[PDB]
Amino acid sequence: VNVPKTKKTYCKNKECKKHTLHKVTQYKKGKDSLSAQGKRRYDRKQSGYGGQTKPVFHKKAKTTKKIVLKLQCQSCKHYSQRAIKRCKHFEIGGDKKG
Amino acid sequence: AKSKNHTAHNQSYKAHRNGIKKPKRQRQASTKGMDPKFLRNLRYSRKHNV
Amino acid sequence: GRVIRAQRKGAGSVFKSHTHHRKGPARFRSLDFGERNGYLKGVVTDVIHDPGRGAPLAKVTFRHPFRYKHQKELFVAAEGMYTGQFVYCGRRATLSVGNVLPLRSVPEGGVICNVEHHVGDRGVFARASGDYAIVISHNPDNGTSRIKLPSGAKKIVPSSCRAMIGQVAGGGRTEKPMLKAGNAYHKYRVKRNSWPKVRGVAMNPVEHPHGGGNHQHIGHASTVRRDAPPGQKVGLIAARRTGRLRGQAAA
RNA sequence: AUCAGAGUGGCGCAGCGGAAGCGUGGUGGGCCCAUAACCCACAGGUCCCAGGAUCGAAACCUGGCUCUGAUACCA
RNA sequence: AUGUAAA
RNA sequence: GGGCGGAAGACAUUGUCAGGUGGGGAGUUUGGCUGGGGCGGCCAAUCUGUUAAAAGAUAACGCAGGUGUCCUAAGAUGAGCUCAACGAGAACAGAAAUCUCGUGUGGAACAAAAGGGUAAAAGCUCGUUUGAUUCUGAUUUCCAGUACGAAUACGAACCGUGAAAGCGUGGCCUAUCGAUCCUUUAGAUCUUCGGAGUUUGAAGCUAGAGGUGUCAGAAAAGUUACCACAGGGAUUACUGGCUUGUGGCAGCCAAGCGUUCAUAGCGACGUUGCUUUUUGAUCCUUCGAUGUCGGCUCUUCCUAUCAUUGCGAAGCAGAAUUCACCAAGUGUUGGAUUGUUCACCCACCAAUAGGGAACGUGAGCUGGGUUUAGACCGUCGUGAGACAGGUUAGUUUUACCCU
RNA sequence: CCGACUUUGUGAAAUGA
RNA sequence: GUGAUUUCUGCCCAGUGCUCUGAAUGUCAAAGUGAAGAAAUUCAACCAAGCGCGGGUAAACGGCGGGAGUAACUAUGACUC
RNA sequence: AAACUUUAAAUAGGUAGGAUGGCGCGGCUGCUUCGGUGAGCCGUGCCAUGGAAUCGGGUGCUCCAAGUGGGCCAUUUUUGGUAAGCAGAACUGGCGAUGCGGGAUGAACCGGAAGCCGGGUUACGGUGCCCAACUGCGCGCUAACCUAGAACCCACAAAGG
RNA sequence: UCGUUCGUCUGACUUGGGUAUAGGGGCGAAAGACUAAUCGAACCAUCUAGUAGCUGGUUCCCUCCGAAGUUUCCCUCAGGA
RNA sequence: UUGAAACACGGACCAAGGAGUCUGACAUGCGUGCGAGUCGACGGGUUCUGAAACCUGGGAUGCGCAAGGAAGCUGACGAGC
């Protein structure tokens, strides 16, 4: 599934509130941080004896994710993000269909 | 031991033995859900009756 | 499972050494001035069979160097010793079968037995029936010597380690087939409770890693690792190879 | 009985939609007194029977068949 | 590698 | 000479963290539906058609199939055009290449399964595009009138396209999907860090994603024949019961066989049954126990008659033999092999017909088989072990009660 | 099994800073 | 582990396991090292054993195939593919 | 022709049958229209013999809570199955929870549902004896040398002579 | 346990007493055998009135009303909301 | 239990013992006291049969009288058919 690099949708910033021109990117999960309360809790809980305390997931079933598009308008430099339907292959600015 | 069972047998009896309760028809029927463009007007007139 | 015989032997319960009729520790003399710096004359009195050991023992009656009494020492008989023989101890003992000399005084090529390892630990190598160590070479810049042990290994020992020249008696003993479970039993009563020895494959799983199964088989590799926990380290331990030994590997 | 597998040159097997080959055999020559062997060339097939889609099948899938292999237990 | 049974 | 004599020597080693190995050991798990269970399959999410009995709802391991995708166009819209096929024609050109005219109710296409829908379009080509956007509700479908998914109709914006009406909150409609906690991201020039501040970090609020396919969402492999417990006839293997496809037994028709002659004796192609000694099917009684194969023993009963008494028919000359009739009174054997019922042989015989009685008969025997614990082989399993494979050893309890 | 810290002091050279 | 004596123990080190070697530029903890920071901290380099790469080992656990054609009667198949 | 249909039933489905209705007057709107144009509401005044039959007090409103969530049979429609006293559905009723009279005997077939008694009359079913009631009045067929035949379910008989 | 019959009997033989090993431990010429009539984990006391969606019982009278085996969800179908 | 006289289980007989209780939180229904208040519950004083009774404090103890927010914070301007 191909999506254009640059798209005109609504920008909610109190400065724009109109269709502007948004650059597109792809959402990629930022890196997990060592100081989040959930992480210092789990690292406290895992410490000691008793082994694995929180469950760990094994029976994976999905093969595809929902893409999230991080659209940045060229006008106030604020992002807003939109998830599209599930797909296997995904490419921004691919050669157009003929 | 077939744990899948299904009938409607006796369900009409349970329904009807205490009637099929119709709701009380109402003077001043409810407006919730109506067209907001119609209801704003309707409210505002009643705001400015005399 | 339950604790396995290889693990039960470390308790001492019934597996201790059957040593009621053994004649005592068979070892050299407490190294002293006289036998550092000369020779002491001792006379064999009897060649006594030591129970539970194939090598005969020789009662040697030294004269105490500085008190007025005899010293009944007790050696491992070197093939050749007889009652009435004079065995001499020390550094200037003549190189005669039965005398004990430091290795600084055994010419290269000579056979020795009962080799000490820390000077004065009274004999540890080449002691069992009919085994000997050959003094391969000397190094006087460090005061050490080298020997070829019975095992085919080659050990550097201090040049002042003593040794009985000759070879231990009782040699050739393990050539005779025992032919009888009876002979085997009477062999092992006087050593220790280690016979009859049951195949693991004919055990139940709860007491041996090879156990159980509608057929008798091991079911997994019989070679176990060096670090395997006690109770798992049964089989062939840390084996470099298996199968019949052919060629150079049989050296 | 179900579950799979393979059906492709005369033989045994390759094969990923543009679509036919590997080894061996067949054919005509050459070396040879002659046959091999070897050297140079030449022809190959209903891609198991009936379909469908599909730029496009022999392959994807579905029906019709033959051989082969599996799991077929507590009473 | 090999060499009509047909004299 | 203030060293007992050596050997190693600030390495081994003790203590604590840190990584790998660790069924040696501990703990636990080892889903559900199911015409018993296991294996198979997914009938657990979920779509279309049918069953579904002309509103709705409607089940089964019912039928025929589908789905976990694909798409910046195959979304929006505006304009223009008509699709499959068939008739006739045109250099190479033919059944089929490209062109022209006519007819063409859709017999084409609409991404996919099926159903429904469409002809100045919903199809084909081109034009400009991003409504596949923002906020929060409503309603339907499921339904407890809960959530989710999906869908519809308004509202307040901002927009696209068209001259405009209008259409447009994704795909022509019906399936194509995801809760709590956690992590991560977007936003306000937001709030808190509680002694007040500056200043990184952390938690917040609103909206997304990472996924639970057992799909309203535990983190989880086997074996037990050495087995234990609470239970179950909600549930198997024996008996019986209903059923009788399968098994056995008998009719009707008559194409032909019977050297000429359908019916002496057959009787194909079809068809009508009977029976309940097999098996199938079910799971109604029985799981706080009904002792489970066979043989031996003994008795009784059935006729669907093998022999024997009387008869009828013949492809009955006599002998033998075949078909049927009233007939169940009497009879139906000794043995090799097998644990066998079954089977097959040898011999006698007038004949060596078939059947039931809880597949008669274990407080009547026997324990050969089977059906525990020992053990062995063969295949499977990495293994503990399995075998509806073969083998060998393996306790048979009580009556004195009522009839 | 292995590394680091620790008991663990004394002094010498060679390569690195 | 096999189980007197006689006789003999064929092939496989790809699978699983065991074991040996580490040039070193794969992977790789704590500690210690450097840089940025106002500091918490983050980053990078270094980085043992172990795995990974490379040898051996079956009297280690174990395993040891199909399909076609062919002899001058037929069959069969010494032979071939 | 269950996964075909032009046509197209029967039974079953929905809605309406007035007092919660209409008409006049004069007012509101920030909606709607070219516009008093509409849409609706608001205040007021008038009307409206009760707007088919029958029947009758209501879940009208709410609270707290029990037990249940194994079903089974029948007439009819119906899916798998050769069929089943089988498995799964649709409408209703029954048994379960229920006695009583009849079908000899039977949970659900026929009649019928009940306080305890006296009197009368019936339903289903019967009147030869068991056993309460007729060996009643009539008319036909059957003669069974097989156990003639004799109750809705119901305890079968077929093809064929 | 009894009877007749059997295996072995100078041997790895039979046996008394002392002593050693005591429970996930012991000991085993290996049968999961033996460890006080108890062993695929003894006995005793305690936590302990362990838990059970499972089986059995659940005690006086009259009066009146009086059902359900059905929808939806749940590792859910012997259960519960 | 869909179905019991069951060839389904328990039951030889008698006597006595024998099984929905008590406690903390909550909820609806009802009674009683007071009612924008109500509680005297932990304490104190008293109490000549008393572990009872009676008095006392609360001007903020609990609940209620005010809610929305995650938090900073804000907090009901007086109803018609």
Ligand SMILES: C[C@@H]1C[C@@H]([C@H](O)CC2CC(=O)NC(=O)C2)C(=O)[C@@H](C)C1
């Ligand atoms: C990998 C992550 C796992 C999962 C989640 O972390 C599991 C949690 C949720 C829960 O129920 N409590 C727990 O402790 C486990 C989740 O959210 C998915 C989106 C993806």
Ligand SMILES: [Mg+2]
């Ligand atoms: Mg730790």
Ligand SMILES: [Mg+2]
């Ligand atoms: Mg049910």
Ligand SMILES: [Mg+2]
């Ligand atoms: Mg022993």
Ligand SMILES: [Mg+2]
């Ligand atoms: Mg041995």
Ligand SMILES: [Mg+2]
């Ligand atoms: Mg052995």
Ligand SMILES: [Mg+2]
């Ligand atoms: Mg064994």
Ligand SMILES: [Mg+2]
């Ligand atoms: Mg083990």
Ligand SMILES: [Mg+2]
């Ligand atoms: Mg074993």
Ligand SMILES: [Mg+2]
């Ligand atoms: Mg094996």
Ligand SMILES: [Mg+2]
């Ligand atoms: Mg040629």
Ligand SMILES: [Mg+2]
């Ligand atoms: Mg040639």
Ligand SMILES: [Mg+2]
């Ligand atoms: Mg030749």
Ligand SMILES: [Mg+2]
């Ligand atoms: Mg374990």
Ligand SMILES: [Mg+2]
């Ligand atoms: Mg367990």
Ligand SMILES: [Mg+2]
């Ligand atoms: Mg199950």
